[PDB]
């Protein structure tokens, strides 16, 4: 709704290269959502824990 | 909707023996009796299938025999049994 919001949502979610020189045990798997395109629903990838 | 429960499913850690019952007289059949009556199968739906069926069971050692502990206190049983004092007292020993 608003262009903060997705501006944070690229500096979170879209940023690539940032915080690379540094230990990173926070991998997570291939997949980490979908989105439907004609019903505009996002189906995020399950968690085995 | 995706569950993981029914995609990852996979045989769990000591599976091919797990039902195994602790006994000493048929256990290979003990143990095909218990891997079908835990399966959920009844006997009067299996039929003449369950009669000459035989199944992996802990009780069998590897060689093929009998056994009723793990094998390494067998072994560790065997090598107690012969341990020969290692300092004796006798009057002539210089």
Known sequence: STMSALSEHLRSDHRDDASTLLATPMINNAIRSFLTAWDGIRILSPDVS | ?94
């Open chain 2, 1 to 94: 909707t995706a569950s993981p429960a029914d995609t990852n499913v996979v045989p769990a850690k000591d599976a091919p023996t797990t039902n195994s019952p602790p006994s000493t007289t048929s256990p290979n059949q003990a143990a095909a009796d218990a891997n079908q009556q835990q399966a959920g199968i009844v006997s009067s739906q299996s039929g003449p299938n369950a009669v000459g069926d035989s199944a992996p069971s802990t009780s069998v050692n590897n060689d093929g025999d009998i056994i009723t502990r793990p094998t390494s206190d067998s072994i560790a049983a065997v090598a107690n049994a012969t341990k020969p004092a290692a300092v004796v007292s006798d009057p002539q020993s210089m």
